[PDB]
Amino acid sequence: AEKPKLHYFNGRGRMESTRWLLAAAGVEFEEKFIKSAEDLDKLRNDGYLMFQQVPMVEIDGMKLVQTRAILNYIASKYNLYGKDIKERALIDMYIEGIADLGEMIIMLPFCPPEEKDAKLALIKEKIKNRYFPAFEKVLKSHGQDYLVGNKLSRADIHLVELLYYVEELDSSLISSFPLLKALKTRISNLPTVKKFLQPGSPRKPPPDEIYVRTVYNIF
Amino acid sequence: AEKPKLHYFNGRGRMESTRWLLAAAGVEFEEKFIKSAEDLDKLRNDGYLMFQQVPMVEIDGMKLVQTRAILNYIASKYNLYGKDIKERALIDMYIEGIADLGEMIIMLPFCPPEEKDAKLALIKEKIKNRYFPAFEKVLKSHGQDYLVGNKLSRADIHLVELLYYVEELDSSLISSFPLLKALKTRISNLPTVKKFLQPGSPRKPPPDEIYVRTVYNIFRP
Ligand SMILES: CCCCC[C@@H](O)[C@H](CCO)SC[C@H](NC(=O)CC[C@H](N)C(=O)O)C(=O)NCC(=O)O
Numbered sequence: 001a002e003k004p005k006l007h008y009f010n011g012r013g014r015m016e017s018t019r020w021l022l023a024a025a026g027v028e029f030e031e032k033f034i035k036s037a038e039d040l041d042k043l044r045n046d047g048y049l050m051f052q053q054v055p056m057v058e059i060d061g062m063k064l065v066q067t068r069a070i071l072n073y074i075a076s077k078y079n080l081y082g083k084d085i086k087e088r089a090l091i092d093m094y095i096e097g098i099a100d101l102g103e104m105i106i107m108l109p110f111c112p113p114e115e116k117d118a119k120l121a122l123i124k125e126k127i128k129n130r131y132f133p134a135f136e137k138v139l140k141s142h143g144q145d146y147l148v149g150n151k152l153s154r155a156d157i158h159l160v161e162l163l164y165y166v167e168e169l170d171s172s173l174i175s176s177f178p179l180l181k182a183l184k185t186r187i188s189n190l191p192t193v194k195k196f197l198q199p200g201s202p203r204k205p206p207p208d209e210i211y212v213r214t215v216y217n218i219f
Numbered sequence: 220a221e222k223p224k225l226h227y228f229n230g231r232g233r234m235e236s237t238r239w240l241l242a243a244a245g246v247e248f249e250e251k252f253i254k255s256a257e258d259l260d261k262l263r264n265d266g267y268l269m270f271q272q273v274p275m276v277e278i279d280g281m282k283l284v285q286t287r288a289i290l291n292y293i294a295s296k297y298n299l300y301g302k303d304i305k306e307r308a309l310i311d312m313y314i315e316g317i318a319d320l321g322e323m324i325i326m327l328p329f330c331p332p333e334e335k336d337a338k339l340a341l342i343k344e345k346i347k348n349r350y351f352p353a354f355e356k357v358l359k360s361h362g363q364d365y366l367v368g369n370k371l372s373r374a375d376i377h378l379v380e381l382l383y384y385v386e387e388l389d390s391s392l393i394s395s396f397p398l399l400k401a402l403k404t405r406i407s408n409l410p411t412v413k414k415f416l417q418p419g420s421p422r423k424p425p426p427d428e429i430y431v432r433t434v435y436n437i438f439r440p
């Protein structure tokens with residue numbers, strides 16, 4: 001077949017987790033960047049977008065929208081979705097906690113300027129008091145190098161992706177969390193991810209002033 | 220061994236689609252309702268809520284939190300998740316569209332009133348202009364009884380659950396969507412679903428104000 005093709009803005013938002021997972025699985029993909037309202041509306045009007053939204057990924061002859069469906073397909077295709085129904089329960093429960101947190105980080109650059117610090121202090125507090133404790137607790141309990149099933153899954157992938165973003169927000173958050181740190185290093189050391197973490201990869205930077213109003217100059 | 224046990228408020232919210240899906244799967248379940256902040260703190264303190272949130276469903280020895288984790292497990296356990304990876308992808312695409320709308324419906328009672336008008340307009344707009352046309356098209360695309368793979372999946376149950384909510388909201392929205400009506404009727408007349416739709420089932424009423432103040436009082440005493 002073809003390379004998976006990613007339709008999105010040139011930036012992180014809702015496509016980034018997929019860029020990570022495909023690169024983490026060692027899958028070359030191509031990107032067709034949505035640069036204007038007109039790129040979006042051509043996709044909408046050509047019938048590529050079931051709910052009129054992106055992300056969309058053309059992969060194995062399907063036009064897949066919705067981040068979770070995109071990810072679930074990719075996870076399952078490349079065996080990063082565990083080996084049984086109980087591992088997937090654990091994995092889903094984990095990655096849904098991550099996606100809740102991660103959702104707040106995606107929306108942060110869109111709330112009104114005057115609300116930004118409030119939300120950031122809220123996020124930070126949720127990191128320190130809810131999400132990091134929960135994930136440390138998981139690694140602490142079983143002692144293993146991976147979150148689930150003692151081998152690599154999408155949950156380690158999505159978790160570390162998020163540890164990077166949290167490092168960007170404030171780097172003292174992971175400090176009381178030894179095992180989160182350790183996980184970040186080990187997974188960052190995997191050939192596929194190491195590669196994706198180097199300069200020139202399809203990995204995207206934080207949202208900046210350009211990307212933010214670009215995104216508005218559509219909605 | 221035992222029946223699944225649902226730990227939620229006494230009402231729809233984030234637990235309702237699990238009630239439909241287990242019902243649709245023909246699975247009897249018990250419900251333990253959270254009435255007070257104390258009930259919530261007992262669950263948290265027992266270490267039973269991984270993110271300190273509910274829904275929580277005790278099922279097959281596990282304590283599952285996160286709606287989608289719960290639903291995927293049930294879905295997969297009772298063969299309501301399609302037969303292969305590509306079917307799963309259509310099911311997920313379809314139900315995440317439903318989830319997006321459902322999220323707006325779930326939050327709508329905890330708006331300030333100044334926001335409630337617009338929010339309610341937005342919900343109708345999207346039902347009319349995005350979601351119903353999207354699923355109608357799918358049904359037209361293949362002419363079959365079911366959304367995916369021509370057998371009952373979780374996608375028909377979540378979508379029909381939605382059609383019941385849109386009817387309560389405004390019964391004229393579905394009028395221009397004959398294929399959506401047809402599905403609603405056929406799914407409602409499957410034994411497990413028929414049973415759940417009858418009066419006196421665990422199916423829950425629309426949120427009212429006793430529900431809204433119950434939830435406020437539990438999280439903000
Ligand atoms: C608040 C200002 C704009 C914010 C837009 C953000 O949602 C994101 C921008 C950052 O990348 S992404 C663009 C959006 N997509 C979705 O919301 C998909 C959600 C689905 N649940 C998913 O996970 O796939 C979009 O295409 N919107 C057209 C529209 O709604 O008509």
Ligand SMILES: CCCCC[C@@H](O)[C@H](CCO)SC[C@H](NC(=O)CC[C@H](N)C(=O)O)C(=O)NCC(=O)O
Nearest residue numbers: 100232233271272273274284285286329434435438
């Ligand atoms: C003050 C107003 C409260 C509104 C709460 C609403 O979100 C919902 C009400 C619908 O009945 S439900 C209670 C909420 N649960 C989740 O948000 C789970 C989300 C997860 N992504 C899921 O899908 O499972 C909750 O437990 N909140 C405590 C907290 O997070 O600390």
